[PDB]
């Protein structure tokens, strides 16, 4: 009943850059500390012949203030000793766009309709995650079958993040 140890967190076994690759739409997230992709988020995963996996993600951000920049991001995933776990180096096509390198755990997915990721920016004294952010990607921006939500529900509680998700909107800003 205790819990909330990043390592305790249970991720999807036998991930598949392949089967996962493609278009994905952000339905929900969890805002880490700092600035962060605000509205209209959409990612595109796609692994190559050598097996390396990279991605792009158009999303809006209120950089500065009154400054609403739909940002075109990109990040290269270095593989880790776990098909599911990853470390994401990234940056924006445009130069002033926040560059960075964070972790990336494909928490869970069923590949065809939903996807849940977690990323622990920074660790806690014991093992909790302080700076932490997440997403709930769907293959269909038109929404998600309850079954999926229902499942998503699980995961979140598992990520010690229940409720804490601000739902994303898709007005087509970009």
């Amino acid at each position, epitope marked *: 009943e205790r819990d909330c140890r990043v390592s305790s967190f249970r991720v999807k076994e036998n991930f598949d850059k392949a089967r996962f690759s493609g278009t994905w739409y952000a339905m*929900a997230k969890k805002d880490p500390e700092g600035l962060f992709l605000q509205d209209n988020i959409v990612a595109e995963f796609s692994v190559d012949e050598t097996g390396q996996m990279s991605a792009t993600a158009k999303g809006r951000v209120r950089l500065l203030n009154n400054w609403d920049v739909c940002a075109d991001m990109v990040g290269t995933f270095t593989d880790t000793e776990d098909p599911a776990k990853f470390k994401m180096k990234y940056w924006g096509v445009a130069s002033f766009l926040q560059k960075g390198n964070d972790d990336h755990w494909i928490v869970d997915t069923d590949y065809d309709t939903y996807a849940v990721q977690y990323s622990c920016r920074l660790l806690n004294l014991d093992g909790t995650c302080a700076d932490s952010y997440s997403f709930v990607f769907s293959r269909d921006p038109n929404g998600l079958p309850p079954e999926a*939500q229902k499942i998503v529900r699980q995961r979140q509680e598992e990520l*010690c993040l*229940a409720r*804490q998700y*601000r*739902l994303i909107v898709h007005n087509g800003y970009c």
Partner: antibody
Amino acid sequence: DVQLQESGTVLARPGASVKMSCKASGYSFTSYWMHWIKQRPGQGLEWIGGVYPGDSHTSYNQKFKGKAKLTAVTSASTAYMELSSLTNEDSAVYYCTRSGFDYGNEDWGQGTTLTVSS
Amino acid sequence: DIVLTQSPSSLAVSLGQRATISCRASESVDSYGNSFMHWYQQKPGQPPKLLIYRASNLESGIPARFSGSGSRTDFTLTINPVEADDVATYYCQQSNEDPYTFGGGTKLEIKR
């Protein structure tokens, strides 16, 4: 944009029963809840309960468990709340508001006034 | 349930200064690392208007005037610079524990 309409005023006799509507329009009726709030004059705001159209699931507040029966037609995109064996107290304005599948407070409906006299 | 109590019930201040509406709790409203408190603006002859979600995160549509704060069992809605058209009743509400509950609200009036 997120439209949320309600039914016209209600007038009912002491002990009778009533049902209200709340059509959804502009968002996935199944990806949200939709709660019913009760506001009496020199009183305030009391949550009643909410429905998960998709799971047809339901959450009530023990203070109303035996007073409001909630339902919802996905296809019709409307949630309902039924007020049973009325008194003079249940008479108040009931509001309908949608709610996230994870948090809690967002859109409110015009609110249907409700009188329970004779 | 948990108790929400609105500090002063009537609230007056001059146009252009700050407001400090309160809302203490019987239990703690914070959990797993956050705070589930919320603020609404209920004007005459109308239904509530969401202002602040999670005692800190502002709602898209609401101006900088507002701003929340708190933790454990002490939170506060900040209205500044109070503006003429902000004359209303402010209710807080929590959703950290079932059943949901609101506050006794507070009527904000302007000094003129």
